[PDB]
Amino acid sequence: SLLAEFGDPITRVENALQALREGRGVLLLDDEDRENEGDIIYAVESLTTAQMALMIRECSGIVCLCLTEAQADRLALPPTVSIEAKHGVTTGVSAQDRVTTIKTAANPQAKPEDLARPGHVFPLRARAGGVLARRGHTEGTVDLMQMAGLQPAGVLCELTNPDGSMAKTPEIIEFGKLHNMPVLTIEDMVQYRIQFDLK
Amino acid sequence: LAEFGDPITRVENALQALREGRGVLLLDDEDRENEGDIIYAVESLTTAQMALMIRECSGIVCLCLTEAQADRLALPPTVSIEAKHGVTTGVSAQDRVTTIKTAANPQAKPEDLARPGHVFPLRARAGGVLARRGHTEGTVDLMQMAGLQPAGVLCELTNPDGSMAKTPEIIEFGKLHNMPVLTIEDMVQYRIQFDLK
């Protein structure tokens, strides 16, 4: 309903995947309900300091790194977890330092000793099966990267209005227009995967 | 930094701002490379103050507690907490304030909080900055020195480009927002001048 003007569910997914392939962000909701809160999602593959600075300044600041089970295992993460790059940072909290931690953690060549614990980035493991197993934003983030053909890691953070209230669907739509970020839902992603990923 | 006064004045002005319900900015010492934090008293914390921290700071807002209060909450001797009641998704400015008030309540019980959550509590060492020169200790000490509920919130100030605000930029922010700036060293010197028998 509230998103129909922006394409049917599969079209909304396709537009989001293309934005990610072009290095741009997307906005993710559970479904079309007017009371949902939403997250900015960026691909790790193309993540820049400027994107992270925007995410921190527009969102809750509790930036989460969504990883596959295999990648989290590579880092020896437990099966709140927080991480910092051991090298290449100063105090860890700046936009640039968080990007360094994120790239270090998501690198398929990473070793546990590349990271210190605790830190300022919060990694989360996506369940096997993605949104077809668990309709979480962690699964949504990793699935979008895989569906787009990108490094299977993304960052997410909750969009927060300047007055401190959380952006709901109507305010998410307006942010997506202001920043040219496609809006899609987990429900849309399920519909896409049921159509294209099943025998 | 001396635009904020001599070191004793810097402490007195910070204490008075907190008594008035306003925030302050804290650095380790006068060195130009230090990065600074906004501090607010829990006793007077508002949604608008929390909203400012989320807009201006890292967003990883920490709640600094006494050892006694952390023991009352059964916190471990990253920890995150959420109010069990009175919140929705926990992340809005209002919900974080609810969690903070619930956690800092002198009559709190462990089950008043869920874990994990969106507020990050830290235990101040007994003795405050005279035992450990951390910003957690600085926060709790300021509240005690000001005669307030001994709990405060802390978050690292950013610059508009996403870098962290260092001393020169902290000084300019304090002027713009009428927030006193002080250092841990200022606090140590003050407490040794005035807090010892």
| Distances, alpha carbon A138 to alpha carbons A53, A128, B21, in Å | 21, 11, 39
Q: Which of A60, A12, A3 is nearest to A191 (CA)?
A: A12
A chain contacts of residue B92, beta-carbon cutoff 8 Å: 160, 164-166
Q: Which of B91, B146, B147, B149 is nearest to B120 (CA)?
A: B91
Interface check for A50 against chain B (CB to CB < 8 A): the answer is yes
Tokens 């004793």, residue located: B8
Cross-sheet strand order for the sheet of B181-183: B81-83, B113-123, B62-65, B152-156, B37-41, B24-27, B181-183
Distance CA B163, CA A49 (A): 9
A117 is in an annotated binding site: no
Distance CA B10, CA B172 (A): 15
Amino acid at A32: E
Interface check for B76 against chain A (CB to CB < 8 A): the answer is no
Strand bridging mode B24-27 / B181-183: parallel
Sketch the domain layout of chain B as residue ranges. Answer: 1-197
Q: For the packed helices B47-56 and B93-104, what is the interaxial angle rounded to 10 degrees?
A: 120
Q: A173-182: which pairs have CB atoms within 8 A and are 24 or more residues apart?
A: A173/A2, A173/A3, A175/A27, A175/A58, A176/A27, A179/A25, A180/A24, A181/A19, A181/A24, A181/A25, A181/A26, A181/A27, A181/A40, A182/A6, A182/A12, A182/A15, A182/A16, A182/A19, A182/A26, A182/A27
Q: DSSP class of residue B112?
A: G
Distance CA B143, CA A186 (A): 45
How is chain B split among helix, strand and coil, in percent rounded to 5? 40, 20, 35
Decide if A9 contacts A182 (C-beta within 8 A).
no
Resolution in Å equals 1.1
Q: DSSP class of residue B165?
A: P
Biggest alpha carbon–alpha carbon distance for chain B: 48
Q: For the packed helices A95-106 and A49-58, what is the interaxial angle rounded to 10 degrees?
A: 110
Which A residues 116-175 touch B at CB under 8 Å?
A: 118, 120, 122, 158, 160, 162-166
Decide if A40 contacts A159 (C-beta within 8 A).
yes
Beta strand residue intervals within A111-153, DSSP E:
115-125
Tokens (6 digits) for A118: 């605790």
A chain contacts of residue B50, beta-carbon cutoff 8 Å: 164
Q: Where are the alpha helices (DSSP H) in chain B?
A: 7-19, 47-56, 67-72, 93-104, 135-145, 167-177, 184-194
Count of beta carbons in the 10 Å neighbourhood of residue B107: 6
Distance CA A55, CA A49 (A): 10
Å from B188 to nearest chain A CA?
Answer: 23
Count of beta carbons in the 10 Å neighbourhood of residue B27: 25
Distance CA A172, CA A38 (A): 7
SS3 A48: coil
Distance CA B126, CA A97 (A): 32
Q: Which of B103, B82, B156 is nearest to A80 (CA)?
A: B82
| A-B contacts (CB, under 8 Å) | 86
Q: Which of A142, A198, A191, A197 is nearest to A3 (CA)?
A: A191
Interface check for A80 against chain B (CB to CB < 8 A): the answer is yes
Give phi and psi for B116, each to the nearest 5: -75, -175
